[PDB]
Amino acid sequence: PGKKFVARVVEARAEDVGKRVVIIPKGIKVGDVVEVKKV
Amino acid sequence: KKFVARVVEARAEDVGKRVVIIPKGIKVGDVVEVKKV
């Protein structure tokens, strides 16, 4: 990896409850791709 | 564009909300920087 990954923004589902996620604020759409870096 | 956030445990109230799923190696409470590609 490298503390840095890419991921497609999705809509959370019932099966996601309890899973590690980051909440996506307004301005970034479902289907948009984001780069995520643990600092 | 770009934002800072902390990794959280998804809850029932998040169903239907915009999220990114966090892979293994990053824990709840970890600070991440997120930017749209």
Author numbering:
A (entry chain B): 4 to 42
B (entry chain A): 6 to 42
How did the manuscript describe this experimental structure?
Here, we study fold transition between distinct β-barrels by protein engineering and structural biology technique. Here, we discover that the previously reconstructed ancient DPBB sequence could also adopt a β-barrel fold named Double-Zeta β-barrel (DZBB), as a metamorphic protein. The DZBB fold is not found in any modern protein, although its structure shares similarities with RIFT and OB. Furthermore, the reconstructed OB fold could also be converted to the four-stranded SH3 fold by a simple circular permutation. Thus, these ancient β-barrel folds (DPBB, RIFT, OB, and SH3) could be readily interconverted by a few feasible mutations through the missing-link fold, DZBB, indicating their significantly close evolutionary relationships.
To test this assumption, we conducted the reverse engineering by replacing segment 1 of design-13 and design-16 with the 8-amino acid sequence forming the Z-loop of design-2 (the 3rd generation mutants: design-18 (tkoL2_v1.2_Z) and design-19 (mkaL2_v1.2_Z)). SEC and CD experiments demonstrated that both mutants folded and had moderate thermal stabilities. The crystal structures of design-18 and design-19 revealed that they adopt the DZBB fold even without the α1 region (segment 2). These results demonstrated that the segment 1 is sufficient to archive the fold-change from DZBB to OB. Most DNA molecules did not migrate from the well when mixed with the proteins with the stable DZBB fold (design-2, -18, and -19) and RIFT fold (design-3 and -4), indicating that these proteins formed large aggregates with dsDNA. In particular, design-2, -18, -19, -3, and -4 interacted with dsDNA even in high salt conditions (500 mM NaCl). Design-2, -18, -19, -3, and -4 might interact with the phosphate groups in the DNA backbone in a similar way to the sulfate ions in the crystal structures of DZBB.
